[PDB]
Design an enzyme around this catalytic site. Sequence first.
Site, PDB file in Angstrom:
ATOM      1  N   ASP A  91       6.729  -3.032 -18.812  1.00  0.00           N
ATOM      2  CA  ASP A  91       5.829  -3.406 -17.732  1.00  0.00           C
ATOM      3  C   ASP A  91       6.150  -4.816 -17.221  1.00  0.00           C
ATOM      4  O   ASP A  91       5.759  -5.813 -17.813  1.00  0.00           O
ATOM      5  CB  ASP A  91       4.376  -3.301 -18.205  1.00  0.00           C
ATOM      6  CG  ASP A  91       3.358  -3.593 -17.105  1.00  0.00           C
ATOM      7  OD1 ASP A  91       3.744  -3.818 -15.942  1.00  0.00           O
ATOM      8  OD2 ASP A  91       2.149  -3.598 -17.394  1.00  0.00           O
ATOM      9  N   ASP A 124       5.426  -4.196  -9.887  1.00  0.00           N
ATOM     10  CA  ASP A 124       4.706  -3.853 -11.125  1.00  0.00           C
ATOM     11  C   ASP A 124       5.075  -2.470 -11.689  1.00  0.00           C
ATOM     12  O   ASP A 124       4.577  -1.438 -11.228  1.00  0.00           O
ATOM     13  CB  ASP A 124       3.205  -3.907 -10.818  1.00  0.00           C
ATOM     14  CG  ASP A 124       2.340  -3.621 -12.023  1.00  0.00           C
ATOM     15  OD1 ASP A 124       2.858  -3.636 -13.157  1.00  0.00           O
ATOM     16  OD2 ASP A 124       1.131  -3.395 -11.828  1.00  0.00           O
TER      17      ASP A 124
END
EC number: 3.4.23.39
Lengths: 321, 6
Positions: A208, A30
């Site tokens: 992201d 992440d």
Amino acid sequence: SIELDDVANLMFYGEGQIGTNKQPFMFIFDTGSANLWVPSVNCDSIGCSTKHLYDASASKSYEKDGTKVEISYGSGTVRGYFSKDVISLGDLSLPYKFIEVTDADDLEPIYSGSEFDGILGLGWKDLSIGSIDPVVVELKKQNKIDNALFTFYLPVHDVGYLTIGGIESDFYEGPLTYEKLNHDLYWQIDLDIHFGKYVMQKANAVVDSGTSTITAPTSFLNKFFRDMNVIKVPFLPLYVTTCDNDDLPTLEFHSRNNKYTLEPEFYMDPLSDIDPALCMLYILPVDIDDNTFILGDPFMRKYFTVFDYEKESVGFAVAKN
Amino acid sequence: XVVXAX
């Protein structure tokens, strides 16, 4: 190089291990986060009953901390205490301070609904809780990889790769174009964003790997989605339009030096569990502030991505295959 | 879906 399962183009996780006994977990790797956490064997939450858990007493390399700590995401909050152990990723290993999650009840439409165990943050030190140095940064300092950088290649549905330390040229075509970060916090660059006719200039663009969609502010998206005959199904983040819509624009992303574009195929897909003539838009309103967009998975599924801590920038190129 | 920190 770490293999990533793809689940409906909305989620990507791969294997990691913690501890002497190589305890396996599935991690969302992440880039919008900067802490590793794993669910503890002391996690009593219903979400935890279907997860691979961590047993410190099984690992002889485990080191106690126990400081209480919390991580909030857009999709919910996890809560636990700090612990230290050796984390393995492919054939790389380092000691690392991570979170034994104890209460995952606040993540809990998503966590029990998904097959990931934990999150492994790939952001910068300042984004982290507890001011932890990133894995890739540490790995370089210990001379376990050639460069403090990593790479995401996500596909379109039937695997992807997190690659640590170097750039594999087979993942893309043509030139790799880097973009200096406006802050070393998220992997965040300046961009002029166009959604058709609606433009926000020098917006805060956050690359992201942990966000399933493209994101804009609510104000900016009311405008765009109004005149796009979409429909929100009441009370879930699902915006639906007809799959044959001629009007859907190729979204544009301009930097001081480079143009990036995202075609409709990359930001929508059919409701193959409902009616396949209807289509789901991977665009969600998320208000961080007045001008932040998340360039999530839709972007990354088109554009091979290089996150370089030494350059303080993100490299983009059109992915191959 | 998923939106990942605050």
